[PDB]
Design a protein around this nucleic acid. Structure first.
Lengths: 76, 43, 49, 105, 155
RNA sequence: GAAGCCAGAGGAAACUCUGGUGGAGGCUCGCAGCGGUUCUGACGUGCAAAUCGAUCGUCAAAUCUGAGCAUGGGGGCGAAA
RNA sequence: GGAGACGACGGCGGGGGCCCCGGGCAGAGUUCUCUUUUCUUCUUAACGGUCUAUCACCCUGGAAACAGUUUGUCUGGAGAUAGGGUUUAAUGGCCGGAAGAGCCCGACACUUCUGUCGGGUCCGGUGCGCUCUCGACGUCCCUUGAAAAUCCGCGGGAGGGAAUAAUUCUCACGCCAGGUCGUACUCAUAACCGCAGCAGGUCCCCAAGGUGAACAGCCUCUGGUUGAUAGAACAAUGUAGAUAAGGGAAGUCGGCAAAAUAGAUCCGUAACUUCGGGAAAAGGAUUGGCUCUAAGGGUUGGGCACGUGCGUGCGGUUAACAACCAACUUAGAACUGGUACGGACAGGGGGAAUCUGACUGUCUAAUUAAAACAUAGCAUUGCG
């Protein structure tokens, strides 16, 4: 697992061809949001403060990338 | 009590008998018919 | 001259202070990039094209 | 100064006339100890009734809801209701008294 | 009716020993009908199988004895069983004393109360067991300062 | 509590004394382990074709021990019985 | 050329885990009386990023009035102290993994199929503690404590290399592939060997709390058992464990056996001696509980003048002061119970001599453990 501290680098990673899927994790106790993209070798995580612009980053993310919100319970 | 050898089972893990509850409340002086423990008792 | 324990503690305190300032400034630049994320996406699009 | 609010709900046994809210208030007033001594309430801890068989505790010290539950269980043991009544934390600072699970035999 | 398999399965599900497993004596047939871990979990959820709590091992008497020994009880000649070195090593006492004296001398030299030659002399006296403790070293330093001031006033 | 080291007191010095430090030894008390001294011991068609109990020796090493390997009867191996 | 690649022991320091102490939420137990109580959950992997961690090395400068320095006396004009840096080393902090997991609690639903929804999972402290690991030292040797597969660095400069652009870049991302077996279970008072489900034998880790010097003995938590033909009675003689008035070895081949001694603190300790010992010699005084007193520690923090939280120029060694934090020993005193005070357990009887082997060590598995054997030392012989 790798952490990305640059929005531009995260945008290029999400536009890589091997980016199979993406998910959004919300931590309201910490008041943060996490964008996790699943590539071939590494899972890349971008950590942001919970904000409207952090929500609008979805619009800058590519459309063909299947993005989903993490549920409260990881049901097996 | 047998606390030297084993712990007492918690009261929440054992379901109480309605007859015993009504008998204890009657001995304490509470009218069980006026409060209706039959509806509160499960099956 | 040989320094004192108070001077050593002051030097140390400046070291964690500058580390904290670097961390805060990195958080600020990340927030600014998040604010200007759409232009960044357009520039990435232009470079790929 | 910090203020802590505590609810002891006994509405169901109070309506069933099993639990005595005034007797519980007197028991709390005589047994809550401040700085290791009972009868040291003053203006620090106030015990009142907010109606419907509920007890209000206002504490400006570091009084614990665990201590309040301990005193409630002591009062239930004195009233011979320990084997039939349970004190359950329902909300933050709220302890409700309720019957245990009953089967029909 | 045999419940050895059910007791073993309930222990494995609950993550406890087989002595902490309680099977309902009034539901023996329903428990015996359970042959899988899924059915064991269902019976645990229904409450026919529970995990008994641990046996009490309190530390209250140990804490009370620790408080009494801290305030000074139970350390008499009829309570000691090991030798004085076995209870408290002279080597550990010497190491602690030397570290305290060297730390104080380093602090005094850094703050400038004593000079470097006096630091060296007091270091070798401390190694030569002149001072019993920090208080004795401090009185020796004060006496040396007073003698130096008297010599400076005379000269 | 051996060398080595520190301090103080003497001595022209070499050394002498005192108080510490240090942690050497096929040293010592002793747990486990290894061994096998004693007892009108237990047991004696036994739990056992050598076991059991108490007591004992040793316990930082000429200590204890696994696996692999080597030495084979005109032999081997033997701190030698 | 480096790695692979290396002894035993001693104390010291760092880190993880365990143990212990306090606060908080939730749950459970106790509750004649007391107990803001006792107990339980409160966790964070591999793999990565980033910031730091003893040794050592580098730059300035040149030290006796020698200095720095470890528990341990080593280092320094072959360059120390000081000041400033560079790096080996993480099982350290934070972040990604990762809360979505695991755990705890609650509320509904539930013939089954099946579950559903909420609330949390936090903050500190301590150490001659136990265990593993790492680091710097030190001691010992007529003992000096593997090899190879494999990997890397350097010397060298052969070849290969550009503007039709080239690239033979140990950087990042991407593509493809990874064959055969073995894997259950026991590892022993019933799964191995001893003719057996035989009280024998058989190689290792991981190892909680209390007492205590202590992986002694005794009690307890987790985890395991409750398995070894049963029932009744209490004769003799037994096996095992005990006590006994008075005398105290009168017993017996023989004090055989038992009893007595025993921990710790203090006083004191002879002959002989290879000067190292003997020695815990011998012989004495004391030990409970309670309430106090005293001593032994750590962290942080000094005024001006300017430039502007740092840089100088000064000025001072009563910080010999304040604030906060902290644990275990040692000594002294009063009071008090007593037939007992190392109250169980645990735990030398001592001494005067003689013979004998120098000592430590070894052997007759299954009757003899010894003046036997070996040992160091000494002496002789043979061999260039």
């Amino acid at each position: 697992p790798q952490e990305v501290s640059d929005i531009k680098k995260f945008i290029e990673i999400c536009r890589r061809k091997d980016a199979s899927s993406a998910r959004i994790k919300k931590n309201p106790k910490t008041q943060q949001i996490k964008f996790k993209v699943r590539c071939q070798r590494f899972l890349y995580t971008l950590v942001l403060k919970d904000s409207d612009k952090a929500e609008k980053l979805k619009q800058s993310l590519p459309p063909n990338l299947q993005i989903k919100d993490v549920p409260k319970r990881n049901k097996r | 009590k047998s606390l030297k050898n084993r712990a007492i089972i918690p009261r929440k893990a054992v379901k109480k008998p309605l007859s015993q509850l009504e008998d204890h409340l009657d001995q304490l002086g509470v009218d069980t018919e006026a409060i209706g423990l039959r509806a509160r008792a499960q099956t | 001259r040989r320094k004192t324990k108070a001077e050593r503690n002051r030097i140390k305190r400046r070291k964690e202070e500058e580390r904290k300032r670097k961390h805060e400034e990195a958080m600020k630049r990340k927030q600014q990039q998040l604010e200007q994320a759409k232009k960044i996406a357009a520039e990435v699009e232009e470079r790929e094209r | 100064k910090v203020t802590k609010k505590f609810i002891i709900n006994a509405s169901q046994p109070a309506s069933d006339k099993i639990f005595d809210v005034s007797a519980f208030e007197k028991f709390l007033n005589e047994r809550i100890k401040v700085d290791g001594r009972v009868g040291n309430l003053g203006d620090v801890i106030k015990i009142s009734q907010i109606g419907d068989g509920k007890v209000e505790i206002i504490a400006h010290n570091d009084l614990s809801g665990r201590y309040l539950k301990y005193l409630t269980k002591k009062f239930l043991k004195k009233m011979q209701l320990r084997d039939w009544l349970r004190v359950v934390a329902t909300s933050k600072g709220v302890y409700e008294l309720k019957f245990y699970n009953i089967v029909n035999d | 009716v045999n419940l050895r398999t059910q007791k073993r399965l309930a222990a494995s599900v609950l993550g406890c020993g087989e002595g902490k497993v309680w099977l309902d004596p009034n539901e023996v047939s329903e428990i015996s009908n359970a042959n899988s871990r899924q059915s064991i979990r269902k019976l645990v959820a229904d409450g026919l199988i529970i995990k008994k709590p641990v046996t009490m091992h309190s530390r209250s008497r140990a804490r009370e004895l620790n408080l009494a020994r801290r305030i000074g009880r139970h350390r008499g000649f009829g309570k000691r069983k090991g030798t004085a070195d076995a209870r408290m090593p002279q080597q550990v006492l010497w190491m602690r004393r030397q570290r305290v004296l060297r730390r104080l001398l380093v602090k005094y030299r850094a703050s400038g109360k004593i000079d470097k030659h006096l630091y060296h002399e007091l270091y070798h006296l401390a190694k030569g067991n002149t001072f019993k403790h920090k208080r004795a070293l401090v009185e020796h330093i004060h006496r040396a300062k007073a003698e130096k001031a008297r010599e400076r006033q005379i000269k």
